[PDB]
């Protein structure tokens, strides 16, 4: 394992609230469909659903604040972020998030993604370190500060990075019948505060044969060396990009519009309103 760092400040950062508009839709399956409208019941992000915007770290005076909370998982999670800074590197999923139970660790870095399932003893304020190498004049990984120890490991997976390099990243996480399923999409945008209007379905990223309870998760962040000085001020980092959006999936019935190339271009939340209930009864 590694040593742990106490980052959470006495002064917390307040969450904001926004809507999902019509986002969070994803290809429920790998079945090809073309020029057709398909009805399916599954865990979807209801339209205009309650969404929370968290700021994990901030520099004001230059005062430091940190509040990177452990959130519930409920029936599934919609996660989104806007950052060109590669600050968000992954997530931790599990129940107790300590050595008493298994937990899922998903970490990205420049070269690969690592996914592990272990009895982890997690730091209260987990994170990854990065610093600016002055001779190579570039950013590099410093030290993991995520967990104190890890045993009983039952799953390890390595592949290519997907969080690395006006860019909206969207993820949906489900934990069903032993599989942790991840869907994602990258979209370019010109909006700052609120989730953009428009439609974009998320493509299947990976199904993982994990087989564990998940009731909570926490985001993993990469912090600059600049931020770890012993003072309360951080002059060497415009940390405002370290924020993310969280909504939650619900069992809903949706109509999905597949165009002639098999792409989902529109959807209907049948329970949203009478008009949608009508389009679902009519099936057109």
């Amino acid at each position, epitope marked *: 394992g590694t*040593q742990c*760092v*106490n*980052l959470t400040t*006495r002064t917390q950062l307040p969450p904001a609230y926004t809507n999902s508009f019509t986002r969070g839709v994803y290809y429920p399956d790998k079945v090809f469909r073309s020029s057709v409208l398909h009805s399916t019941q599954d865990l979807f992000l209801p339209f205009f659903s309650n969404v929370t915007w968290f700021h994990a770290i901030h520099v004001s005076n*230059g005062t430091k604040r940190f509040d990177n909370p452990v959130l519930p998982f409920n029936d599934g999670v919609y996660f989104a972020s806007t950052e060109k800074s590669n600050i968000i590197r992954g997530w931790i999923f599990g129940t107790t998030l300590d050595s008493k139970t298994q937990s899922l660790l998903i970490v990205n870095n420049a070269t690969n993604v690592v996914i592990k399932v272990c009895e982890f003893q997690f730091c209260n304020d987990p994170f990854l*370190g990065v*610093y600016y*190498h*002055k*001779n190579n004049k570039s950013w590099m990984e*410093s*030290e993991f*500060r995520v967990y104190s120890s890890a045993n009983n490991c039952t799953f390890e997976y390595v592949s290519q990075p997907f969080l690395m390099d006006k860019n909206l990243r969207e993820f949906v996480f489900k934990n069903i019948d032993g599989y942790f399923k991840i869907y994602s999409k990258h979209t370019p945008i010109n909006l700052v505060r609120d989730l953009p209007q428009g439609f974009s379905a998320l493509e299947p990223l990976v199904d993982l044969p994990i087989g564990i309870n998940i009731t909570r998760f926490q985001t993993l962040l990469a912090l600059h*060396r*600049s931020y*770890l*000085t*012993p*003072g*309360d*001020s*951080s*002059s*060497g980092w415009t940390a405002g990009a370290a924020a993310y959006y969280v909504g939650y999936l619900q069992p809903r019935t949706f109509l999905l519009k597949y165009n002639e190339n098999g792409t989902i271009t529109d959807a209907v939340d049948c329970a949203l309103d009478p008009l949608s209930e009508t389009k679902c009864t009519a099936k057109s």
Partner: antibody
Amino acid sequence: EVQLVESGGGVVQPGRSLRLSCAASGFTFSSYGMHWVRQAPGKGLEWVTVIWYDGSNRYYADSVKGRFTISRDNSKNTLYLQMDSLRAEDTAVYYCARAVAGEWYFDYWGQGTLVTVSS
Amino acid sequence: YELTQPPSVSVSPGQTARITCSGDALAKHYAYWYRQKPGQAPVLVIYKDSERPSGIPERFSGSSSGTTVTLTISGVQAEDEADYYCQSADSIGSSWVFGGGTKLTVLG
């Protein structure tokens, strides 16, 4: 303006304990991380320990890990170093120093206090 | 993590003294230089390899090169005879380190 004044140094037998104090003035103590650095007579500078602005985190040099405890009382603008299980090799002037805000060096130094460990 | 600098450097008055500090960490992070005279607390001379504090005269210049940083003192005078220490900090902010120190002797 800024002042750091050490106290608590003296002569003590090996294995005994001693508590150093540093009284800070002229700046917002609580906003700055604080260090102890030491210097054995005739020898060079050795970083000993650092404490964060709010005490949330503490780091110790390997030579003193397990023996020394750094702490602070921001309401009294006072930094402390508790030295337990002193060894002959702890004989040194102990300096209090301020961690520059925003970098990795020391921008202000105390006048030092002498600790002599001897049987 | 450890910083290696020569124990003694001798220069004549008016000449340029060059004190080197080497170590792998120096390729990653900034180095800092301090002057200490007998019976006194150290005084910052160079920070971030090359920058001078307001009180530090222009005769003190810092440079860097791979795993070695260099403090250059031009126009060396008698008052510059002292011990000079290089300093760094690790990647994660858990450790500060001093070099062994260099005694600068002014000849004549």
